[PDB]
Amino acid sequence: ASQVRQNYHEDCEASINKQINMELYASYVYLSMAYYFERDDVALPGFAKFFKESSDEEREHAQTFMKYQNKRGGRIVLQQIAAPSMQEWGTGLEALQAALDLEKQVNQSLLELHSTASGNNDPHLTKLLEDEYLEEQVDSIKKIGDMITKLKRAGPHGLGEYMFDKELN
Amino acid sequence: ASQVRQNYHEDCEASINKQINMELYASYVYLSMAYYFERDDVALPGFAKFFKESSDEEREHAQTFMKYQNKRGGRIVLQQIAAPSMQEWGTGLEALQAALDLEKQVNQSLLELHSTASGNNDPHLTKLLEDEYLEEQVDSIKKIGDMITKLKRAGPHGLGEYMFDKELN
Amino acid sequence: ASQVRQNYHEDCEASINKQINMELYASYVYLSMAYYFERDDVALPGFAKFFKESSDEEREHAQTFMKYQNKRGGRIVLQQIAAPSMQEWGTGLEALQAALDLEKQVNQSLLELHSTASGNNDPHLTKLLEDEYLEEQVDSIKKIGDMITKLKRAGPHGLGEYMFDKELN
Amino acid sequence: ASQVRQNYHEDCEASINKQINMELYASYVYLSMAYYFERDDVALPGFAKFFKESSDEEREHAQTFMKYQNKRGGRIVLQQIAAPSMQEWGTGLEALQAALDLEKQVNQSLLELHSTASGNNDPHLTKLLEDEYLEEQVDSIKKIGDMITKLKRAGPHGLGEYMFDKELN
């Protein structure tokens, strides 16, 4: 029996382990996009840098959940990380739309995890989710929505995509 | 046809893609070990920090290969990342032995990739492998060998493991 | 008999002298392009500056080979430098494509020289070629490939060429 | 018709193009001398450095004429650069005498170009020639004359050549 565990439901512990995998998956997707935009035949360095930083953030989200698991006396169980769904991501706009949709799926999963935590009356976990995850997700979704509108205004192809990429760099 | 590709054999391009997966796998293994050592019932912070840094290094190795692929005009193909073989890694010594064995497998794979590059007379790739990979691997293997000898001298269990962990921290 | 000469094959010495001429030729080509882009009826200062720096680099490559020749106890034999193939280089894009093709020819010549050095078991020369020439050539080819993709995105004519030129300046 | 061209005679434009080739030729001669003096069996580092700097100056003279051509709305036409007349330049004194004679030929060519510019009543070109070329040539000829006298006093062979070379370094 873990000496620190208190008011930590096994359903919460399992859902966190599933969420760690999702965060690692998203890290991997953004890493693929990052290097997709450094191909000699794409050469969008601003987009590359945006997705590299996003990739790093997602791995930090995974690590914060892993640390959270250990703090509550849960046990981390790591699974395989699926390959990204694409190898090639299209235009800058198509990648930002893909990222918008991923960020929303992650948000949905975090809200499901918040409801699991509430149903088990775990206010420490609901607080973690509100302060460190749900707020970041909403800011990110808004940021990516702004970027999509801006790229569609400026481009979304050709000189406009070239200009927008520099504001990202 | 990629505009930059010159003297880059498809066998070299495939072996690099396989090596990227191996590096990502090793990153994942060390990440698991890192958080294993932050469990309340393990609490070896020096070991945790050693494996966190190792995890980061392996992801950098993967990224350098991805960048290398793009520089030569190859195309990155990402696959799934297997789960680490264990969820729990035992003693500090058992983890260092596991890491020693992983580092040697990676070294073997890099030497196989060097032989593929030589057989296809690609001196740019053999040089990359010698300067950025094979040297690091030998230094790492020696470093981990030293650590194992030192932990077996000091411990490898109890107060000795507690003392050795602080030299890692 | 040169007092320093050791394990230096005359075929290697001749191929270096031919490579010095090629490097000087490329310097001259880029010098022509540089001043082509300072014509009152072209006025692409970013392109001018890119080709001026390229011209300087190529003369440095020639000088490093000349110094290398003297270090091994070979003897420098200088030939005439052909006129550039054009007097006028067209658009920024046409010049970058010409430079991409030149850089690849030079790369091919360096790889031939590496094979001559290997066949004569001269590891000092293969090392020179790998560290100081072949790596630079691959980075340059990738850089120019990126620039071409970027100019085709932004332009390649008109306002896009005007914008791209400023990122070069 | 070039939008900037005013009072610029085609004979002046052709003579400038011929003068650019001469300057590039002299650069090449001094570059050969420079590396001749870094041979293991010559080892006169002061002379090497003097001729390297001279080589650089001549390429700057060529570039100033190229820029001048573009400013007046002439068009640069580049020809082949002949090989230096020697591969080996003898003693330090023999090289300085060769350089003295080259500098005087260049001076003669510049004075011919000044007379062409005067005959066509181009005071902008006569001014360029007087301020940026003819003065430099006279100072250079005097400097090289001084050096020859000094080397003949000190040496011109043996310990004297060894001492003089250090005042050049």
Next chain:
Amino acid sequence: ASQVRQNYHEDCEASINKQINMELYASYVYLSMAYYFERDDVALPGFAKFFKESSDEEREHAQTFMKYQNKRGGRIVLQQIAAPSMQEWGTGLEALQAALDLEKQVNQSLLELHSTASGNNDPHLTKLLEDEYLEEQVDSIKKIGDMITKLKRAGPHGLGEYMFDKELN
């Protein structure tokens, strides 16, 4: 069985041990020359300092091989160090010629060791030899060749030897 040893052939391990002895031998030779030039009846302090530094370098070369042996999991076996072939080294020129010949023998031995490493497909050892030994040897041989030419110009006896010695100091 050494825990770190991987792809390290016993022939390579033996040749390294022989090379350590050669490096220590050369250190000893240069140490003898160094103090030979501090004799009251020789008093060439620049030569003394050159050979003292050379002596130190050779001991560093030996130490780098010893460290290399341990890194690969080989075992250092030290033998006796022969006495220098002379007790008295003659003129500064005779010592520089002796050093030139020693440096070339060492270079030959290193090239033999490179061929042993290649024949056993050890790219880590070939890389060590190319980056840390063969390049240094070629620069040293060229440097000593330059010095010999310079001393023969200035002297090689009497006032010229006295002047050259100060450029060494």
Next chain:
Amino acid sequence: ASQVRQNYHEDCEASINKQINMELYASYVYLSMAYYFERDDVALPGFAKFFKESSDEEREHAQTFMKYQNKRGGRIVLQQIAAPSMQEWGTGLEALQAALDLEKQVNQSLLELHSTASGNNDPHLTKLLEDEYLEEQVDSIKKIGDMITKLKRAGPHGLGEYMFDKELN
């Protein structure tokens, strides 16, 4: 006849030459011990560093005697340096005991040389020996005696040897 030689007996000159060899021998022994402790299966970095510094000191002792020989107008005669008696030195304690015994043999040899110098009424040599050698030897013997007592208290094996090694580092 050496112009500086005064009151310098040939027996003193020979004994100094023998003492130079002994000092070089001890340097070599400590160099072997130093790298013995950097083996992957020993990994006692504090001991390595202690013996590396000791090795350096002994070579300085040899050099001070060589310089002394030249100052008095004696002539340095260098002999072969025997291989160290072992290739492997055992435990840290066994090496410190070996070093204690070597330091005492050297001390005995220096005292014999002091008696030779006194018997020949050479107060300059007795002074050298007292100020620069005999005092250092006594401090070293005391230091090594202290270390042995301390290692036997702390260890001399296992965690104690691991702790003591850090006070050496």
